[PDB]
Structure formats: C-alpha cells, structure tokens
Amino acid sequence: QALSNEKKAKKVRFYRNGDRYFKGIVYAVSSDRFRSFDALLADLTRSLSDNINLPQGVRYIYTIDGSRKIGSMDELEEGESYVCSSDNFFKKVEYTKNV
Amino acid sequence: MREIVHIQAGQCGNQIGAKFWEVISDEHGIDPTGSYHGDSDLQLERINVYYNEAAGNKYVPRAILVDLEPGTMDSVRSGPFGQIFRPDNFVFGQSGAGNNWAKGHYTEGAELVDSVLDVVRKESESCDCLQGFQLTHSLGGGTGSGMGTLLISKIREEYPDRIMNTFSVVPSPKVSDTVVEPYNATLSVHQLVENTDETYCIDNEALYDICFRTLKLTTPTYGDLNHLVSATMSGVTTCLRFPGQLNADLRKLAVNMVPFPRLHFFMPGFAPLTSRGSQQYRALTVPELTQQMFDAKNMMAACDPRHGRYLTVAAVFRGRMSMKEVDEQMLNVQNKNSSYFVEWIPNNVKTAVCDIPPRGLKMSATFIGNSTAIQELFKRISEQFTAMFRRKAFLHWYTGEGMDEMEFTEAESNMNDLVSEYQQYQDAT
Amino acid sequence: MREIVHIQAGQCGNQIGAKFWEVISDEHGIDPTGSYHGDSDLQLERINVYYNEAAGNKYVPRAILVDLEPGTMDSVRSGPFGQIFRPDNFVFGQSGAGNNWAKGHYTEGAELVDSVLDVVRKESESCDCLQGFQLTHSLGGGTGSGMGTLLISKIREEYPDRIMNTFSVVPSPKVSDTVVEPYNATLSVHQLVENTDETYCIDNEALYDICFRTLKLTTPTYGDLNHLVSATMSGVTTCLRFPGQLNADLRKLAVNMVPFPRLHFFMPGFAPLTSRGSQQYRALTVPELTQQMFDAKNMMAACDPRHGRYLTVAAVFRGRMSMKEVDEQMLNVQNKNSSYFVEWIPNNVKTAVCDIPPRGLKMSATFIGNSTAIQELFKRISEQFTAMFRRKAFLHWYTGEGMDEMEFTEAESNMNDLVSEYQQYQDAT
Ligand SMILES: Nc1nc2c(ncn2[C@@H]2O[C@H](COP(=O)(O)OP(=O)(O)O)[C@@H](O)[C@H]2O)c(=O)[nH]1
Ligand SMILES: Nc1nc2c(ncn2[C@@H]2O[C@H](COP(=O)(O)OP(=O)(O)O)[C@@H](O)[C@H]2O)c(=O)[nH]1
C-alpha cells in the first residue's frame, strides 16, 4: 500500500496562564514534528512569552478546567484548548470565554 | 482625497511592485532620494493618492511589503528606488514559505498577519477619504497565495465597502514553475471569489509572446516583463491622478465591468506596443490603438478571446484626442464583430479618456476586458487539480499542517460552480 | 519664585540626576564651568527654579546628593558637569547600605538623616517662595529605598503643604537585579502611599524595549536609558520655566491627576521617539505626537494600559502649535477608545502647552497618565513578597536590625488594601 498511515496534525489551542487578553495560537501538533513530549515544550517557549508573561518559562501544562497535569502527547486529544502554566500554582480564570 | 493603499506579497509581488513604483515616480517626477524635480504643477495636485508628504518636502510611498523570508526584501531596499520606502513597512518573517499554501495561510501566516495589520490600520487611519486597496501577488507560490489570501479575508471583515483589486499572476498552461501549482491555485481562487471585487488574471506565457512577437526583444529579462504589467496597473488609475474629459476611477470600473458578483476575473491589455526599429513605420492615431487592443496577440492571459464572448469591455485612453474619433472606433468593432460580444447586454463598451500621456509617448490606451474565454483558464486548473488529487499525492505536506480533505472538496466544487456560470451566460438569449 | 529643591539618593538616583542636570544645563545654556553662554534672554528669566546665582555670574544647582558609600559620589564629581555642584552638598557616609532596607532606614539611615536635613533646611530657607521638592531614587536597592523613604517621612513633618514627587524605578517583572527586591519594594510602597503626593513608576524592562523596538539602538548603555527619563523629568516642569499659552506646574498636575489621596501612582511617556535613520520618513505634526503616546509600546512601566482603565491623563505639549489641533486630537482618542477610559469622570484629559521646544527638535510632548493597569504591577510585588515571606527566608538580615514580623504584616496588608481600590474603581458606574 502507498496511501500511508495519515500523518495528521491535531488542531489544539494554547492559552497562557493569567493573561486574560490572549486567544491561543493553533499549532500543528503531530507525531512527525515532535518525537517526545519534552520537544513540544521547546516550541512553547518562543511563541507564548514575548514581553509580559512567564518568568519561569514553560513547565507545567494544565487542562482547560484544569485538574490534570498533562503527561505525554498521547494524553492530548483533538480539538480542545489548553492552558500553559509554569508553576505548581494554578490561576483559575475564564480562559475559553470569547474565543 | 481618494487614496490607495498598496500591498505587496511574496517574491513575485515585490518584483512587480519594485518596478511599479519606478513608473509612478517617473510620471510624478520623483528622484530615488524622495524629493521632487517636476516642471508642471499638475504632478503635485493629486500626489496624495500614492504618496504621503513627509517633513522636508519628501514624498514616501503608501506601500506595505510582506514576505516570509528576508531574501527578497534585501534586494528591494538595495536596488534603485529602494531608499524611498519607509523602513517600518518592510514586514518580514524568518521561517519562510517553503513553496506551500498551508505554511502560507495557516501556520506561518497566522504568526505574521497580526503584525501586518498593525501597519495596514495605521496607514488607513492616516488617509483623508480612502478609495480602496490594491494587491500584487501570484497564485503559484506560497506567500502570494497563502499569506496573500489571508490578508484579504482579514481586511474584508474590517472594511466591507472599500474596493479590493488584485493583480494576480495565473500560472501558464505549457510550462510549470511549481510542481504543486494546481493546489496553490485551486485553494486561492476559492478565497478570491468571495473576498475581492475585481481581479486581473495575467499569464506569464502571454507576456513572453509579446516580447517575442510584438516588441521583438532578443533577451527579455524580468525587468522587461514586469515593465508591461506596471504600465497596465498605472493605466487603470490614470483617470484618478490627472484631469480628463471623461473621468473614471476604481469604482466606476467595478460597476461597469462586473454584472454578477462572482464574474469578476478580467484580462488586461496595453497599447501601443511598438518594436525598437519599427516605431517609425507606424502612425499613432486612434484607429491604430483600437485595432491593436482587440486582437488575440496583445492579451496578457494565455487564452484566445475568440473562443468565448465579451461581457463587458473597458478602454482607458490617455492623451489628447477627439471624442468623436473614439466613439466611432468602439462602435465599429462592435457592429462587425457582433458574434463575439454578448446579446443580452447592449452597448457593452466603457470609455474613459484622460489627458496626460505616459512619459515618452504621445497617446496610449489600456484594455480592461471581461470575457467567457477565461473558462479555458479554469478548466486547466481544475483538470490538473483532479489529476493530482485522485491519487492523493503531495497531500501529506498539506494534511500535516492541520487540514482535511473537505477543504479540498469544497474548493474544487466551488471552481466547477464557477465554470458552470461562464458556460451558462455564454449561451443566453 | 516657585523654586524646586532636588534630592538624590543611592547609586541609581545619582546616575539619573547626573544625566538630568546635563539636560537642564543644555536648555538654559550652562557650560560645565558654571557660567552662562546663552543667546536669548528667555533662559535667564526663570533661572531661579533650579539654580542659585553665585558671586561672579555663576549658577550652581539646587541639588542634594545622598549616598551611604563614597563609591558613586566619586564618579559624579569627576564626570562631565560634575564641577558644577557645590562640594558641601555631597553628603555621604562610610558604612554602606549592603543592599538592605533595614540598614538604609533604621541603622545607618538614622546616623545620616540628621546631617542631610541640615542641608535641606539651609536650601529651603534661601528660596523666596518654595514650590515643592522632588526626589530620584529606586525601589530595588537599599539607599534609595531605606534612606530615600526616611527623608520623606522627616520632610513631611516639617513641610506639610509643599508637594513631594518621586521618580522611582520600580523593578522589572522578568529579570531581577536584587534577590531581596520584593522586600525592598513592599517596605517602600508602604511609606510612599502616606507621605507623597504623586509618584512616577518607571520600569527598566519598558526602557529596554524602547531602545530596541523604537529607537533601534545596537548597544544601549545607561547613558542612553537615563537620557529618556531625564527628558520626562524636565518635561513636567517645562511649563514652569518658560512662558506658554496654557500653563501648568507641579500643583495643577497634582490636582487634575489625583482624585483620591491613595491613587497617585502614574506611568510616564515621551514623544516623539524617532530612530537614527527613520527620522526623515516622518512628519512632525500634532496627530503624529498623539498616536505615538497612547499606544502600549511607548510607556515606561512594564504594563499594558489595555488591561485597565485610565482615570486621568495629562499631556504636556512643547513648541508652537495650534490649540484647535490639540483640542481635537485629545477628543478623538477619547470618543473612539471610549471603553479604555473611565465612565464616572467626564473629559478626563488635561492639556498643557508650552512654547519652547527641547534642544534639537521642533515640537515635543510628554505623557503623564494614571491608570488601573498598574494593579498588575502591585500583584507581582505582592505575589513575590508572599512567596518569600511564607518560608520566612532572608529574614534574619532584617530582624537582626531591630525589626519584627508585624512590620511586614502591616506592609503587605496595606498593599492589598491598595489593590482592592484599583479593582474597585475599575468597575464603577
Ligand atoms: N512576472 C513575473 N513573475 C515572477 C517573477 N518572479 C517570480 N514570478 C512568478 O512567481 C511564481 C513563483 O512564486 P514565488 O514568486 O516564489 O512566490 P512565493 O513562493 O509565494 O514567495 C511563478 O509563477 C513565477 O512565474 C517576476 O519577476 N515576474
Ligand atoms: N535606569 C537605571 N537604573 C539603574 C542604574 N543604575 C542602577 N539602576 C537600578 O538600581 C537598582 C539597584 O540598586 P542601587 O542603584 O544600587 O541602589 P542602592 O543599593 O540603594 O544604593 C536596580 O533596580 C537597577 O536597575 C542606571 O544607571 N539607570
């Protein structure tokens, strides 16, 4: 067979912690672009913090609710937004309002 | 009043624009420094349409230059008339398109469009009464097709009444500069039919023939091909920058050429085009300009107009000439060629006469013609699209950027909904 | 009349002041010797506000310089415009701060403040009619935060009606010059909210962005960062030193900007700021100065004003300009941006127009804006304070200088009584 295994990109959204005025850039999360979960955090470094957020950078990704620390990329899913934090302390504001 | 904001995109959109601002500066008399060296006061009367007066009697263009790699912006600022652009307008990214529509419209287009629109909004709030935009891009590449159609979808949400015309470069039928150019053209016409007001389809192959058959040039480089497109771009708005006898603009052509809001793909044409040693064996009269426009060897799209029917025809004349002599030649080519025009539109020729010629000639014309002979142009994109899509080849470079097959299916179905309209109104009664 | 006594403190307060007196001397035309080399008689009319005429037509500054080690005073007297200060004003101790608030306000602050106030009282009894003081310090270090707030608590007991404005340097959010800078800032805002009248919050991080994004400087040293602060300090009192059309001073801004006696933390802004090669691609008009002040990339505190609401806005214009052109641009940015201003204060823009520009430009502005977007500035100090205090780390360097935990608890409770006011008046009706 030549029509291969459908290398697909998840369309996920990444809000940043605390900043209420942010929308979240849709990334091409795929198994072709990131071999490890630790390689996904490296792209989150430059494209989230520009001038004012995240002194510790990108460490701990939380759910949109959020109550589960995200493990590997197989813990992710297709079409759900996420909040990107950098501490054990989670700020509970309304992220997904007014997308 | 009536200002125009110029937007460029991609490698091809820069090198048309870098030649376009060399022609506009020679009509208004602008040095490469940015000062003024004119002789008559008619050049400074309507200078505000393409220029903002800076401090110290310098005029800078109202241009916005977009690319995804700095390789082409480095040649624009270093060439002639490259010191005239403002350094803030050079908006460029570091990644690069990769000759890819998905990297131009979804991934790297979204990281740049929020920085481009900070420049579009700043220039639009500085003009007194905005006429409308214009865009120069190409349907073959990645930046001019992905980033170029992304800017139109964001502008039309903000300015729903200003006109928006694009000078696209439709890919040639015989040779192919890009392997995936059917994908980059099918996924771009689907954006242009819902977000523009008029569109100028230009083929490269029809420009190589004019430099070989009409102008008789030995070695035509792109300085000689893009000089013909820049003469046509200035020839549309030339009744807006100078006083005339029968005036037109970018709004009167958008009314008189577009009868249905989906049929707005044109084909351009310039006249006169003389050779280097044959410009003395010719009289420059109005019946010479007329019979050089309407023949098939002077169009700029690779399609013979004899295969179809003209819906609407615009002819923008320049220079001092008798109005009786113009109103008779347009009538005479409509009575004897009564089959190649359409029946359900009587008197389908629009006339516009300016007063000031281009620099060097005595009188000149510009042909802006709509036709159903461009249905041959969309059969060849749709045939080459379905030849590549049915094997689903070159698809994992698109699906891997967050895209599904339904994006392609609604794109090709829209194009066959466009071909079934040009075939429908060709055989009316 | 209306004299101003200038007080400096710490390492940072000297190197702002040593650049500040270089800008004032160039506006009034003073050599580094101390003589006068002006051309017009407007420079000597109001010379008494920052200068005392010495014997022999020499003018010396009314400056009082405070430090705890002689290491920074040695560079001030040896640099340019360092021979102009009187040698008695260099009040310095031998111990040193140790980058410590308790050594700056309790132990070594008390051994020096009785010698500093012998110089403050001598300069205040020599002026005819005192307008008010001013102070340049920094909230990060020890001398500018401990000795700096100790001087304000002693002055306010002696001069309860004169104004007192401080040009503080609030520490940046991302990088940290001092490990214990949350302690040195929390224990200083508790002193400033009860003893000052208006306070200019300046972040270092917002000044590195202007030298990188706006002015396009390759290697900005502190001679290039402190030159922007000294232009803003002179731009507030510039309607007091020169005749104008609509005059202001340090009292009219203290009335029109401060609606409640606890809400007096500002954010400054200067305009125009051109690059080195982009100061010819720009017209210097009033609608260019207006749309360069109000955007977020020209503030001097690291906080976007879009997160909150402006309570009061002052704009001090300099140079000859039409008053109709100023009164329309301030109105236009208030009608279209009607959400980012506050509702229960109508017409919240204060205008002041001087006549004499800065040396080199043709016209200039200065933005003095109050906002509730500085509640983000006090959340980050209060979060970093409670992160360090709940483990009681770096505390034995403070308790060992005669201090208890109740000094910290009433300091952090005062700051959360300040955050609950900016959140309260942001959502009024
Ligand atoms: N007329 C003309 N077409 C050009 C020129 N340079 C490139 N092109 C066209 O541009 C297309 C290639 O795409 P490209 O310019 O690289 O755009 P991008 O890949 O989106 O940046 C082809 O159709 C070329 O014929 C030029 O100087 N003149
Ligand atoms: N803008 C500016 N800030 C400075 C300069 N020198 C030091 N600082 C700031 O001063 C603080 C360090 O404290 P310091 O000046 O030593 O004060 P002290 O310890 O009380 O004597 C930090 O916030 C620095 O950013 C300068 O030349 N310019």
Numbering used by the authors:
A (entry chain N): 44 to 142
B (entry chain B), C (entry chain b): 1 to 429
From the reporting publication:
Strikingly, the DC domain density in the rapidly polymerized WT‐MT reconstruction most resembles CDC, while the corresponding density in the 1 h MT reconstruction resembles NDC. An additional difference between the 30 s and 1 h reconstructions is that a short peptide corresponding to the sequence that precedes the DC domain is visible in the 1 h MT reconstruction, but not in the rapidly polymerized WT‐MT reconstruction. We therefore assigned this density to the N‐terminal flanking region of NDC and modeled it accordingly. Comparison of the reconstruction of the NN‐MTs—which can only have NDC bound to the MT—with the WT‐MT reconstructions confirms that the 1 h WT‐MT lattice is predominantly bound by NDC. In 1 h WT‐MTs, additional interactions are mediated by the N‐terminal flanking region of NDC (residues 44–50). On the other hand, NDC shows structural rigidity regardless of the architecture of the MT to which it is bound, and this MT‐bound conformation is highly similar to the published NMR and X‐ray structures of NDC (cyan, RMSD = 1.3 Å).
Doublecortin (DCX) is a neuronal microtubule‐associated protein (MAP) indispensable for brain development. Although coupled, each DC repeat within DCX appears to have a distinct role in MT nucleation and stabilization: CDC is a conformationally plastic module that appears to facilitate MT nucleation and stabilize tubulin–tubulin contacts in the nascent MT lattice, while NDC appears to be favored along the mature lattice, providing MT stabilization.
